Every structure is written in structure tokens, then in C-alpha cells.
Amino acid sequence: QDKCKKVYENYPVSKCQLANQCNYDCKLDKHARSGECFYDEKRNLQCICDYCEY
Ligand code: NA
């Protein structure tokens, strides 16, 4: 799979900082298996949904 992960674009950064938010919104809003917040190389937080793994 080349497309396991995918940013949730314009996802609130404030929500990214809080437990469960990105994970459950990824599941709720995108039907994804999971999500997590990570920085990127420009050092800003993003919510990355994962469609392969829980
Ligand atoms: Na969490």
C-alpha cells in the first residue's frame, strides 16, 4: 500500500493537542482505521489518518 496515511487538512491544531481527538475524528469523519498527530518537517502539528492500521 502506497496510501496508508493521509493528512486531515485544516484539522484544528488545538484538537490535535488533546487525547483521542484526531484518532476518533479520523474514524468518525473519514471511516479510517486510526489517526495520530505528528509534526512535519516545518514543525507544525497535523492529524494523519491511517487507512491500513488501527
Ligand atoms: Na491520543
From Swiss-Prot:
- InterPro entries from the UniProt entry: Scorpion_toxin-like_sf
Q: Which UniProt keywords apply?
A: Antibiotic, Antimicrobial, Disulfide bond, Fungicide, Pyrrolidone carboxylic acid, Secreted, Taste-modifying protein
Report if keyword Nucleus is assigned.
no
Q: Where in the cell is it found?
A: Secreted
Superkingdom of the source?
Eukaryota
Which residues span the membrane?
A: none
What intrachain disulfides are recorded? 4-52, 16-37, 22-47, 26-49
Q: Which GO terms describe its cellular component?
A: extracellular region
* Entry annotated with the keyword Transferase: no
Where in this protein does the record say Pyrrolidone carboxylic acid is found?
A: 1
Gene3D superfamilies found in the cross-reference section:
Knottin, scorpion toxin-like
Coiled-coil intervals in this record? none
Q: Which GO terms describe its biological process?
A: defense response to bacterium; defense response to fungus; killing of cells of another organism
Family that this chain belongs to:
Belongs to the DEFL family.
Its quaternary organisation is: Monomer.
**Function summary:** Taste-modifying protein; sweet-tasting. It is 2000 sweeter than sucrose on a molar basis.
Protein's UniProt name: Defensin-like protein
Q: Which organism is it from?
A: Pentadiplandra brazzeana
